[PDB]
Amino acid sequence: GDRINTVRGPIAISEAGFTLTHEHICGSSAGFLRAWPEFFGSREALVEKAVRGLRRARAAGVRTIVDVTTFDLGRDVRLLAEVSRAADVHIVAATGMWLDPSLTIRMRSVVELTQFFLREIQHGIEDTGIRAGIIKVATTDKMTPFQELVLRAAARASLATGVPVITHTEGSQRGGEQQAAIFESEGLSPSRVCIGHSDETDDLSYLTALAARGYLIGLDRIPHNAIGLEDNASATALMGSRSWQTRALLIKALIDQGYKKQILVSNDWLFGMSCYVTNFMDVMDSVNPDGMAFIPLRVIPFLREKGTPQETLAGITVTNPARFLSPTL
């Protein structure tokens, strides 16, 4: 209610500071980092790259990241704990479920998924005692039956704990609306929900409608663009053609519509990546050398150039994440 759980323990709301609400130390799959660490060079190579990247972000103003890596995205909470300490940046760990649930997970019911999410929030992740401070879910272009089950369990978990829900959206079929519908069917308050990856579209009518219903809007893939890489069908299919300025202009567009309190901005960056083509991390790094420092080094000065008040920018990067992460019913 006035404290948030991090991988180093509980902190006061005021200690969060500049917060990136959608990031990753490592994007992977369940158990993979432990079974084949040499895929990332080594576990130590990954730690070192991540510590280095978080220090760069820290030097640029970032105090806290929310790692929205879930069980099926290969979340390694011990990795998060080590990297948090070494880089001296707060990290909030996630529960929930992304788009790659294993057979065991796909066989579970809403009540079983709720119990799993609650365990990671209320008791801790694995045998670490480290508690989730956020619930991450995801749907495809069209939501599948199992995805709905995850969203219902997430709502049930949120209603029992006050922990907020962040979503992954994709495609053209306005996924956020499908999700919002399920959430409200479970009686979940929109103010507890961040509809993520919303900068992926230029449909401003879609975002304002969601915001007008009280939903937080996640503009979290700002640096993700092919800044001179069309000779990679893999990149264009997982990055895009809209420049980071185009994505950044949605932030100001929503501000101008009166929704500054509903905006959450992030990089959706990572330091290791195994769930796409080999070495794609190198391609991402070539495009955005700033890493998680992209938002404070590039996006923030840009919005200020376009006339955005310091009061507003401070509110988006500090107040909004604080209000959102603070457990509330």
Ligand X SMILES: C[As](C)(=O)[O-]
Interface residue list for its own copies (CB under 8 A): 28-32, 34-36, 38-39, 71-72, 74, 99-100, 102-105, 107-109, 112, 116, 119-120, 125-127, 274-278
For Zn ion, what does the binding mask look like between residues 253 and 282, x meaning CB under 5 A?
A: ---------------x--------------
Nearer Cβ to Zn ion, position 270 or 313? 270
Is 22 annotated to bind a ligand? Reply is yes
Task: Give the angle 128-133-139 at the CA atoms, nearest 5°.
Answer: 110
The interface partner of residue 175, options being ligand X, Zn ion, its own copies, none and the CB cut-off 5 to 8 Å by kind, is: none
76 is in an annotated binding site: no
DSSP3 helix / strand / coil % (the chain, rounded to 5): 50, 15, 35
Please say which residue, 108 or 168, places its beta carbon nearer to Zn ion: 168
**What one-character DSSP code corresponds to residue 42?**
-
End-to-end CA distance of the chain: 9
Please give the Cα distance from 154 to 266 (Å, whole number): 22
Chain centroid to CA 300: how far?
Answer: 19
Among 70, 76, 68, 67, residue whose Cα is nearest residue 31: 76
Q: How far is the CB of 153 from its own copies (least distance, A)?
A: 13
Contact map string, positions 15 to 54, toward Zn ion, x by CB under 5 A: ----------------------------------------
DSSP class of residue 30?
T
Asked if 68 and 166 touch (Cβ cutoff 8 Å), the reply is: yes
Closer residue to its own copies, CB minimum distance, 44 or 88? 44
Binding residues for ligand X (CB under 6 A): 27, 73, 168, 268
Annotated binding-site members for Zn(2+): 22, 24, 136, 168, 197, 268
